[PDB]
Design a protein around this ligand. Structure first.
Ligand SMILES: Cc1cc2nc3c(=O)[nH]c(=O)nc-3n(C[C@H](O)[C@H](O)[C@H](O)COP(=O)(O)OP(=O)(O)OC[C@H]3O[C@@H](n4cnc5c(N)ncnc54)[C@H](O)[C@@H]3O)c2cc1C
Ligand SMILES: NCCc1c[nH]c2ccccc12
Length: 436
């Protein structure tokens, strides 16, 4: 009777939560697989994370699921190396990773400025805008100003040199999964607050520990708890939402009546659904503007064992590339993040070779793979990231129709499964509370 649209983490956890409360539900998934933008798949001779992959015990919702489904000890840290390669001014620079992390640490210290006054409770991101905010009016003028500034301009204005500017350019090409210059600096500042305002903790939480058994160990766990079969290959085309319940029409014309709808379809894919009545103009504006998730994630296999770390600013095909697995077949698997999905074919060896050639001439690519989420009709975006203005006038606007998903979370929004687990569960609680 409650229809959940989408069988990603948010819809799976919402279903389990409704099941706990004894509330009847049905999950409709457009694809022939569950997991959504988390997708552990058999590629290049390894289970590979085609979507998300890193976790941490400081992510409350993700960690509780890790504990629930037996993965407590099944995490492995990504490998480290001694040297990094970077491109500052149309030239490749090689230096120690220690020297790299010092420059990045100093830049993040400037990027985080204000986060202690903005986010004393980092799960209350809009507290500065609240009615009883008790800080100075200056802190109220800097918060709104930061929503309209990108994270690179904060570093340029502090007088950092071009090398550091190019390093943070590359960093946020990966972090903002697209063009960082159109992004909102407050995203970066909230990441810092959730990470005790320390760059090393931020990296520990988002880019260190991998699930040995993949995200699949978690989303199959949740689905394995459900007492109602997920309806795969059942795309939703129309949602009618009134005061008395709602109606959902599938792509095939099947009409489902429902007391409520929990819609986990990401912003990049909401255009496939006709909403009757139409969504509010403020929400439609965000849907038109889309995310800042125009990038891509690649997996590259090269000959030999090489501990590699490369940074390249926009418009590089890939901005951050790092070794992740050393195969017993004398090869290394690297992961890369790039700002523009249309400038790279994730499955073309020549394009992957062009990526490695950004920094080196002695490394040979033998395979490459990736799923282009932006060109995936049911996603339309990688992980959700914020354009200018979307920290205070974006994700919070989505409020018997409820939107749930990582892109609307209070905490680790968009970038982490933690946000999907948070918002799926709390949205189910909204439905539970209304029926009680
Ligand atoms: C490349 C990439 C790497 C990532 N790496 C990490 C990482 O290392 N760590 C981490 O914690 N997080 C990571 N994430 C983030 C994580 O994948 C997401 O935050 C989380 O999976 C989002 O879940 P969701 O349920 O909110 O949305 P989704 O997973 O997008 O679920 C929505 C579901 O709705 C379905 N759907 C869409 N339209 C319709 C329709 N019309 N009818 C029916 N069903 C429909 C979709 O097929 C999908 O199954 C990554 C994301 C990406 C894209
Ligand atoms: N696949 C993990 C995506 C990610 C989360 N945080 C990041 C920071 C920089 C680059 C990628 C990421």
């Amino acid at each position: 009777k409650v229809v959940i649209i989408g069988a990603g983490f948010a819809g799976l956890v919402a279903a389990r939560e409704l099941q706990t409360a004894g509330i009847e539900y049905e999950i409709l998934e457009a694809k022939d697989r569950i997991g959504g933008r988390a997708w552990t798949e058999e590629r290049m001779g390894r289970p590979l994370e085609l979507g998300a992959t890193w976790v941490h015990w400081f992510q409350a919702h993700t960690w509780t699921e890790i504990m629930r489904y037996g993965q407590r000890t099944e995490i492995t840290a990504s490998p480290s190396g001694n040297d990094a390669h970077w491109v500052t001014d149309g030239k490749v620079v090689k230096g120690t990773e220690d020297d790299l992390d010092e420059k990045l640490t100093a830049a993040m210290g400037v990027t985080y400025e204000g986060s202690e006054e903005y986010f004393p409770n980092p799960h209350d991101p809009l507290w500065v805008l609240s009615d009883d905010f008790d800080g100075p009016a200056e802190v109220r003028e800097r918060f709104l100003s930061d929503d309209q500034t990108n994270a690179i301009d904060l570093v340029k204005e502090a007088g950092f040199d071009q090398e550091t500017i190019d390093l943070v350019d590359a960093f946020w090409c990966a972090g903002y999964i697209g063009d960082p210059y159109t992004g909102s600096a407050l995203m970066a500042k909230q990441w810092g607050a959730l990470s005790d305002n320390r760059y090393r903790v931020m990296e520990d939480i988002t880019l260190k520990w991998k699930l040995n058994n993949g995200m699949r160990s978690l989303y199959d766990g949740i689905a394995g708890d459900l007492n109602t079969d997920i309806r795969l290959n059942t795309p939703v085309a129309k949602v009618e939402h009134h005061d008395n319940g709602a109606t959902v029409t599938t792509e095939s014309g099947e009409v489902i009546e429902a007391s409520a709808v929990i819609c986990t379809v990401p912003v990049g894919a909401l255009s496939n659904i006709e909403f009757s009545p139409a969504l509010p103009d403020a929400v439609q504006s965000v849907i038109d503007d889309k995310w800042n998730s125009q990038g891509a994630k690649i997996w590259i296999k090269i000959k030999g064992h090489h501990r590699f770390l490369g940074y390249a600013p926009k418009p590089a095909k890939m901005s951050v590339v790092r070794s992740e697995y050393f195969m017993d077949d004398d090869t290394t698997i690297l992961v890369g993040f790039g700002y523009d999905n249309t400038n790279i074919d994730l499955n073309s060896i020549e394009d992957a070779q062009a990526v490695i050639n950004q920094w080196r001439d002695d490394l040979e690519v033998v395979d490459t793979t990736g799923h282009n989420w932006v060109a995936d009709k049911w996603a339309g975006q990688a992980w959700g990231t914020l354009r200018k203005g979307q920290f205070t006038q974006g994700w919070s606007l989505f409020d018997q129709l409820f939107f749930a998903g990582s892109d609307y979370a209070y905490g680790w929004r968009g970038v982490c499964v933690d946000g999907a687990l948070e918002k799926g569960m709390t949205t189910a609680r909204q439905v539970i509370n209304s029926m009680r």
